[PDB]
Amino acid sequence: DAERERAQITLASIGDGVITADTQGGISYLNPAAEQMTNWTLDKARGLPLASLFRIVDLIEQILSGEIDGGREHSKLVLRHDGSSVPVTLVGAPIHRGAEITGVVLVLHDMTRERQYMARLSWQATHDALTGLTNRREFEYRLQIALERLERNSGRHALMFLDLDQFKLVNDTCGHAAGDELLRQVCTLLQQGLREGDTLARLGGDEFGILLENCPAEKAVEIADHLRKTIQDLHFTWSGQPFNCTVSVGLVHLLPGISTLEEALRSADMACYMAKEKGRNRVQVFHQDDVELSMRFGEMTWVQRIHLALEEDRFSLYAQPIVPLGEGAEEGLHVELLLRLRDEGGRLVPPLSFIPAAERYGLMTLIDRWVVENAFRTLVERAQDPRAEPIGTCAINLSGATIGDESFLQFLTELFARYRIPPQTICFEVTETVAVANLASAIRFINELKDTGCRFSLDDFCAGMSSFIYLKHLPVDYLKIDGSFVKDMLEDPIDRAMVQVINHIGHVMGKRTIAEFVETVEVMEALREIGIDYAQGLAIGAPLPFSR
């Protein structure tokens, strides 16, 4: 029928190569994109076998009907038979007649064409890949325009920082794929509650940004409380299991002309942190003098609380083993160090409660200098026993405060002299986020320490081009695959490939990989099969006391 013309136009409109072949070989259809890719017109290629023209290699034109893919892209090369290869990502599917497998269809994507997609490159640079909302790049730009513009600048604006109180919980509990959905659902929820001419963004992690251009002070708080209540009223469930979904809002009434971008962002960040300190699931409006004193007070509260904890010897160190998945691998003992604080009452405080508050008020350099010294102090005390299990590696986490700290190296040279621990045994751990936050400083730090004999590790690493662009400049020795991927790796196929990608690129960049959150032997065997170097988790070993 002439309905073929409609179908032919549709397939011609599509950018990807479309090859339709018979169950044995012979070509049925070729869209112009496939005709171009294969160097063969359908006029002169119809009925001729696929393999006896060009070649799809790394024979293959049978596993589609048998057992392979079913949606997952696979890297292949179209050997033209004259003008060499065309790099493609294949998608195969069997052509049926109910049960009768009559042929096979292939969806080929030219990896060379990627470079040409401009409207897509322009989008990604102005939007978050996951949510589809504007990113910090575009958001700060939009905020700056709102603060300097001459036209449409009659009223006052409103800036909100909305932190999803349960994002880490969902993500760590259910896996990366779950927390991505929670963010994907919270996005549309805020999107529903926002008028036209309003900027909604994801400024990273669990944080979202709202810009309310030309909005009165009352309306601005009324809108905030509503979005806060609607996230609270949102019932989030992952594989039937429900989550107590809620958000911490920080509001800033902005003024165009007199207020600045740095002040605007720093003010919304103070007020947001305040809603969290004031118990989470709260809106907090910024005020320059009053309810700003709360930060001045909080500084003194935490200076005293952290210092008291150091003099009262309330901090203790725990050790969690990291083991090689390598076949018959010996090596020394490898452990990561985990900090534990015991409150005045005598209860173990998890790092959730004090580390962010000690990060905010700038007391982390202290905690790091305390941790490193006690890790060396404990290593000497352990060394006293001849029969004791020798430690080949000892991973210690460093804050952005320490990376910025110019006096740290001297302190470490002083620690190495005093305790005589070999540098090689030590492996400092910095998170990909912390490194990118102060990029120049992380590089300069990493190199100064690597030259001392120490080792480096890039904790909580998530694959993407940016991360692999950053990884080029960070001379780390190891890569800690973010546990959220390792959690539901055997459940969601995207996270299994996300682990698979970190491993290959990690190895290509000459880095040994570590999988975090390896809770089950089944997970461990999955990672061993993939070729992950080390496993850390509950199936390996739980944190046990290191210090006294």
Ligand X SMILES: Nc1nc2c(ncn2[C@@H]2O[C@@H]3COP(=O)(O)O[C@H]4[C@@H](O)[C@H](n5cnc6c(=O)[nH]c(N)nc65)O[C@@H]4COP(=O)(O)O[C@H]3[C@H]2O)c(=O)[nH]1
Q: List residues binding ligand X (CB under 6 A).
A: 172, 320, 338-339, 350-351, 355, 368, 371, 397-399, 459, 516-517, 519, 537-538, 543
CB-neighbour burial class of residue 367 (10 A; exposed 0-12, middle 13-18, buried 19+): buried
- Return the sign of the alpha-carbon dihedral for residues 186, 192, 193, 199: positive
Tokens for 46?
Answer: 């119809």
The site partner of 124 among its own copies, ligand X, none (C-beta below 5 to 8 Å per kind) is its own copies
Q: What is the DSSP letter of 116?
A: G
34-51 CB burial, b ≥16 within 10 A, e <16:
bbebbebebeebeeeebe
Q: Which helix (H) or strand (E) holds 506?
A: helix 493-508
The site partner of 472 among ligand X, its own copies, none (C-beta below 5 to 8 Å per kind) is its own copies
Tell me the β-bridge partners of 221. none
Tokens for 93?
Answer: 């599917």
Residue number, 91 or 325, with CB nearest to ligand X = 325
The site partner of 75 among its own copies, ligand X, none (C-beta below 5 to 8 Å per kind) is its own copies
Task: Decide if residue 412 touches its own copies (CB under 8 A).
Answer: no
**Closest distance to ligand X from the beta carbon of 9 (Å):** 43
538 annotated as belonging to a binding site for a ligand: yes
3-state secondary structure of 290: coil
Q: Which helix (H) or strand (E) holds 435?
A: helix 432-437
Question: 17 with 31: CB under 8 angstroms?
Answer: yes
Residue number, 110 or 492, with CB nearest to ligand X = 492
429 annotated as belonging to a binding site for a ligand: yes
Task: Decide if residue 433 touches its own copies (CB under 8 A).
Answer: no
Strands 55-57 and 74-79: antiparallel
The site partner of 96 among its own copies, ligand X, none (C-beta below 5 to 8 Å per kind) is its own copies
Which of 51, 107, 490, 539 is the binder for its own copies (CB under 8 A)?
A: 107
List the beta strands (DSSP E) in 170-226: 199-201, 207-212
Closest C-alpha among 163, 24, 31 to residue 110: 31
Tell me the β-bridge partners of 416. none
Residues numbered 162-221 forming contacts with its own copies, rule: CB under 8 A: 188, 191-192
244 annotated as belonging to a binding site for a ligand: no
Closest C-alpha among 509, 405, 387 to residue 449: 405
**Closest distance to ligand X from the beta carbon of 339 (Å):** 3
Q: Tell me which stretch binds its own copies (CB under 8 A): 221-229, 352-360, 493-501, 519-527.
A: 493-501
Task: Decide if residue 83 touches its own copies (CB under 8 A).
Answer: yes
The site partner of 371 among its own copies, ligand X, none (C-beta below 5 to 8 Å per kind) is ligand X
Residue number, 86 or 434, with CB nearest to ligand X = 434
Question: 321 with 394: CB under 8 angstroms?
Answer: no
Question: 512 with 455: CB under 8 angstroms?
Answer: no
Q: Tell me which stretch binds its own copies (CB under 8 A): 100-108, 327-335, 417-425, 538-546.
A: 100-108
The site partner of 387 among ligand X, its own copies, none (C-beta below 5 to 8 Å per kind) is none
Which of 25, 26, 32, 141 is the binder for its own copies (CB under 8 A)?
A: 141
CA gap 396, 334 in Å, rounded:
11
Which of 41, 52, 62, 116 is the binder for its own copies (CB under 8 A)?
A: 116
Which of 39, 89, 316, 433 is the binder for its own copies (CB under 8 A)?
A: 89
Tokens for 113?
Answer: 């064409």
The site partner of 410 among ligand X, its own copies, none (C-beta below 5 to 8 Å per kind) is none
Residue number, 139 or 517, with CB nearest to ligand X = 517
Residue number, 119 or 417, with CB nearest to its own copies = 119
CA gap 215, 251 in Å, rounded:
12
**Closest distance to ligand X from the beta carbon of 395 (Å):** 8
**Closest distance to its own copies from the beta carbon of 466 (Å):** 5
Phi/psi of residue 209, each to 5°?
-115, 135
| Contact flags string 17-56 toward its own copies, x per CB under 8 A | -x-x-------xx---------------------------
Q: Tell me which stretch binds its own copies (CB under 8 A): 136-144, 159-167, 212-220, 402-410.
A: 136-144
Phi/psi of residue 449, each to 5°?
-80, -40
Residue number, 192 or 384, with CB nearest to its own copies = 192
Tokens for 225?
Answer: 């409380």
3-state secondary structure of 351: helix
**Closest distance to ligand X from the beta carbon of 157 (Å):** 35
Question: 210 with 160: CB under 8 angstroms?
Answer: yes
Angle of CA points 161, 164, 166, to nearest 5°: 160
73 annotated as belonging to a binding site for a ligand: no
Q: Which residues does the annotation place in the binding site for 3',3'-c-di-GMP?
A: 339-340, 368, 517, 519, 538
Q: Which residues are annotated as a binding site for GTP?
A: 166-168, 171, 176, 180, 202, 280
